[PDB]
Structure 1
């Protein structure tokens, strides 16, 4: 069925599925206890998150879940990327086992910390969040990975408020895009997507940078919805004409100019992740 990969395999007898965390796209995610998944402590149970198919799964859903698991393998480890811990790939349903982030996705996290007009985000927190995600994305870029679905909803927050890029279902090696074919990039959410991904059917690191701009806007509006009141059907005409989202209130001119830089029409005129990391480092240090 699936070719065995001993390096990553995890005994099913050692995994105890628990309460569900939620559902979307090609899968479901449940909380679980894994005994000895940290090999240095073979009798310790760790709380983990298990991604598996839903009952109404399609062939494509399975393909996507396999693709995500395989991608997590190719990427290697980093503090701001959700860690693959192992997989049950043999003699039963596909379980992809990830490190557990207790606080769920960043969009809901930020929305829950909006003031009345479960605590409050400081400016420094927002910049920190942004910086962590830039570092994650820089590392990703260096591993030849394009994520293609960057967005607040695809970031998980740990118990200690560490930001972890997640949901690698759409992620590709940079060389594994079907350039110029009309079906290419057809499953990317339009409001986070670089124009060239649609108009040219390509996807480079600079396309991810565009998405990161949108994510920055989400962060600074505390989980606001991009292009409020503009239907998806009308976006791409407005973008060709040079329309861009206005500056969020609790955001500096400098950080807004960085967003606008990520949204440069010309992909090559956008900053790299490395430049974003350096700039955010400087700003975070100063605050």
Structure 2
């Protein structure tokens, strides 16, 4: 659970995100290149708010125990770094693009069921992910996906089922629920809206030409956020992906219900995805 700074050997950059970076390191106490590979997150540059938010992320991940959530390994102190298991297949978005001629509808349904099971578990922990997208899902194997990146995650108080953010988000706007776009309201029901966008991503194999951004922009002087909110309020939605099974498209539409209270729960979605055959 405690990793010594001097034994973590830098190998390469895995990613850069919101005020932080994830690096591939080898935890090599023998110094002979035989140690295990780990994914290590740290804050890129100082900030008091970012530091509090980083400690929050570590506290959230440390207490999550699911086959469908990236495993917390430990921390290194200077909390300097968050140590996690390394998944060499990487993000689901790039994985789907490379293996599209190999993965069938059954396989996409299996991934959908696994993400929905991880999300049902997050909900049971009163955790709001706030950044669910195929780029934030990791691939353990050909038949196993895991939710990652809890950098924007929040724990709901026992007496409040949503939360309000002071400043508007910094993520691509095409995954946000209408209530998040209009009032900065986030809940487990806005994670359900984002999951509908994840299902769309899976069934387009994350093809850039019909991505949520390429397609919403194509359907779209007025600000882009306000224009997307206008489209959504009118009842306009992303179209059924090419060759998408009708039942899968119908589920995406339920996730995209205008009112958060009308969206299905992750517990109700789960058996439905499993019935379609995971």
With structure 1 as the length reference, what TM-score do the two structures score?
0.83
* 1:204 correspondence with 2:214: no
Partner in structure 2 of residue 263 of structure 1: 256
Looking at structure 1, the residues matched to 20 and 163 of structure 2 have their Cα atoms a distance apart, in angstroms, of 29
Partner in structure 1 of residue 175 of structure 2: 192
SS of 2:212 mapped into structure 1: coil
Closer, same or farther: CA 265–190 of 1 in aligned 2, 3 Å: same
Kindly indicate which of the two structures has a greater share of residues assigned to helix: 2
Looking at structure 2, the residues matched to 63 and 182 of structure 1 have their Cα atoms a distance apart, in angstroms, of 16
Looking at structure 1, the residues matched to 14 and 48 of structure 2 have their Cα atoms a distance apart, in angstroms, of 23
* 1:143 correspondence with 2:143: no
Looking at structure 1, the residues matched to 81 and 117 of structure 2 have their Cα atoms a distance apart, in angstroms, of 28
Partner in structure 2 of residue 32 of structure 1: 25
Closer, same or farther: CA 181–23 of 1 in aligned 2, 3 Å: closer
Partner in structure 1 of residue 42 of structure 2: 52
The answer to whether the 8 Å contact 2:110/2:143 transfers is no
Looking at structure 2, the residues matched to 172 and 180 of structure 1 have their Cα atoms a distance apart, in angstroms, of 8
Choose from 10, 16, 20 the match for 1:23.
16
Partner in structure 2 of residue 95 of structure 1: 81
Partner in structure 2 of residue 172 of structure 1: 154
SS of 2:277 mapped into structure 1: helix
- Report which stretch shifted further, 20-29 or 205-214: 20-29
Structure 1 unpaired stretches of 5+: 1-7, 37-43
Output aligned runs, 1:221-240, within 5 Å. Answer: 221-224=204-207, 225-227=211-213, 228=215, 230=217, 232-233=224-225, 234-240=227-233
Partner in structure 2 of residue 67 of structure 1: 56
The CA deviation at 1:266 is 1.6
Two-structure CA RMSD over aligned residues (Å): 2.5
Looking at structure 1, the residues matched to 80 and 48 of structure 2 have their Cα atoms a distance apart, in angstroms, of 13
The CA deviation at 1:258 is 0.3
* 1:80 correspondence with 2:63: no
| Number of matched pairs | 263
Looking at structure 2, the residues matched to 159 and 96 of structure 1 have their Cα atoms a distance apart, in angstroms, of 23
Partner in structure 1 of residue 270 of structure 2: 277
The CA deviation at 1:59 is 4.2
The CA deviation at 1:153 is 0.8
Looking at structure 2, the residues matched to 182 and 139 of structure 1 have their Cα atoms a distance apart, in angstroms, of 23
The answer to whether the 8 Å contact 1:28/1:53 transfers is yes
* 1:109 correspondence with 2:102: no
The answer to whether the 8 Å contact 1:27/1:65 transfers is no
SS of 1:126 mapped into structure 2: helix
Looking at structure 1, the residues matched to 119 and 58 of structure 2 have their Cα atoms a distance apart, in angstroms, of 18
* 1:253 correspondence with 2:246: yes
SS of 2:87 mapped into structure 1: coil
Looking at structure 2, the residues matched to 88 and 19 of structure 1 have their Cα atoms a distance apart, in angstroms, of 18
The answer to whether the 8 Å contact 2:27/2:36 transfers is yes
The CA deviation at 1:15 is 2.7
Partner in structure 1 of residue 235 of structure 2: 242
With structure 2 as the length reference, what TM-score do the two structures score?
0.85
Looking at structure 1, the residues matched to 69 and 19 of structure 2 have their Cα atoms a distance apart, in angstroms, of 20
Closer, same or farther: CA 57–199 of 1 in aligned 2, 3 Å: same
Partner in structure 2 of residue 5 of structure 1: none
